[PDB]
Amino acid sequence: RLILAMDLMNRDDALRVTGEVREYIDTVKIGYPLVLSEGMDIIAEFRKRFGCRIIAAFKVADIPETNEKICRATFKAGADAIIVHGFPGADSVRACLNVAEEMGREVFLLTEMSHPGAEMFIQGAADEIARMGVDLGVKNYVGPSTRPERLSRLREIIGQDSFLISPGVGAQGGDPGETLRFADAIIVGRSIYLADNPAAAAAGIIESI
Amino acid sequence: RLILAMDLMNRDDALRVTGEVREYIDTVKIGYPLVLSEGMDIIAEFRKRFGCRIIAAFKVADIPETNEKICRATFKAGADAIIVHGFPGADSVRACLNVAEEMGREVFLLTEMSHPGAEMFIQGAADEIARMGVDLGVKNYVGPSTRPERLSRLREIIGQDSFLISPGVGAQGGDPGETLRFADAIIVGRSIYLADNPAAAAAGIIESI
Ligand SMILES: O=c1ccn([C@@H]2O[C@H](COP(=O)(O)O)[C@@H](O)[C@H]2O)c(=O)[nH]1
Numbered sequence A, B: 001r002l003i004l005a006m007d008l009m010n011r012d013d014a015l016r017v018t019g020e021v022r023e024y025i026d027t028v029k030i031g032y033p034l035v036l037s038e039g040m041d042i043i044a045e046f047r048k049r050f051g052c053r054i055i056a057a058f059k060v061a062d063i064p065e066t067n068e069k070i071c072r073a074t075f076k077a078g079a080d081a082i083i084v085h086g087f088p089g090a091d092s093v094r095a096c097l098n099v100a101e102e103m104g105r106e107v108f109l110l111t112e113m114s115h116p117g118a119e120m121f122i123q124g125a126a127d128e129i130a131r132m133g134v135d136l137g138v139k140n141y142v143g144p145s146t147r148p149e150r151l152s153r154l155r156e157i158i159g160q161d162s163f164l165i166s167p168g169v170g171a172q173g174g175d176p177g178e179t180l181r182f183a184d185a186i187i188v189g190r191s192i193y194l195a196d197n198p199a200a201a202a203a204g205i206i207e208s209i
């Protein structure tokens, strides 16, 4: 129920930390901080080295045509799933779903974000973004640990069978236990990778879980 | 280090047994007995239901053009890797490697088989099939548990970094421990799925390992 957000930017440190906490996870979320610094080949290296599932945290938010290209490159690189923003609309999300279907991969729909600014425009559209996901057949979602009442509403819309993961635990203020009342898994980055002992930090989260 | 060969033909029994032994594995080898009976959709169902890696045991052995089509359908269905026969030659293997590269997936090269008949024609070509794999850049191989001296020779050719899995353990007479002196993982089918208590059978193998 714990996903590591590996946002370190240098390959050596990323490999060190991921290896140290491998026993407490099986899924690593890799995003642009690491990929832009070390290249897309890092995805296949991680998948092979650690035998974990890899979720690409690219939160695609372009027009349909470009979203298709990004998804294809991401799955070609070996990612098991890609996170997609829902605010750009149904056609942009459908483009990602089409490529995931073609390549036997998964799409996670980001519905409401965890940072303070998410309240400005995203929050007001979040319920509709989640309903759009349900209408499109999306089965994997991302919602905020920092707002459990919003996480509850998201779970209500997507149902119990849908898979929901949630960032914002630790550094941003979210609580593991409270978040897991609604999400199937929690995403944790800094609380683990910036810790003096990442393995102990992960173990401590697991214990409370 | 244990891969389940799930060759039961009915979905209910396959799901039952795989769920019962899930804690002892993380990789399931699915082949034609199950796929032809329940459809290719069973691959994605297993991947989702159990969160395990899926190796498609199709041992592709056609001309390049057809091998390409089979590999594409297999990866579209969600398989993480596909097993390919090496006896048909380099072009047939290259066709599979090309699709695996396009889709961010893996190819396992079957070099020598485990049954008695493998001594008739395959064994005499096995060393060369393995060398061909090395020349083509193959990093994943399949060799026989029933002939550890042959498994040793295969390991010698492919090197220590290559990943080697081995069927023939249990029902066919192979030994877990002896096989693991050379292979990274053992494939076990009947000894587990036909057992009165599959979980206990898997646990017993794990203990001896
Ligand atoms: O609404 C969202 C969507 C994505 N992330 C991402 O999830 C991770 C959370 O990291 P951290 O705050 O645990 O360090 C980071 O990769 C971050 O970009 C959020 O934090 N909130």
Ligand SMILES: O=c1ccn([C@@H]2O[C@H](COP(=O)(O)O)[C@@H](O)[C@H]2O)c(=O)[nH]1
Binding pocket: B005, B007, B031, B057, B110, B112, B113, B114, B115, B144, B167, B168, B169, B170, B171, B172, B187, B188, B189, B190, B191
């Ligand atoms: O040389 C080979 C190649 C493949 N398999 C396959 O590996 C599995 C071994 O099953 P079992 O003998 O443990 O039941 C089966 O799916 C079988 O088709 C072998 O046994 N030997």
Ligand SMILES: [Cl-]
Binding pocket: A031, A057, A058, A059, A083
């Ligand atoms: Cl993300």
Ligand SMILES: [Cl-]
Binding pocket: A058, A059
């Ligand atoms: Cl972004």
Ligand SMILES: [Cl-]
Binding pocket: B031, B057, B058, B059, B083
């Ligand atoms: Cl096989």
Ligand SMILES: [Cl-]
Binding pocket: B058, B059
């Ligand atoms: Cl066959």
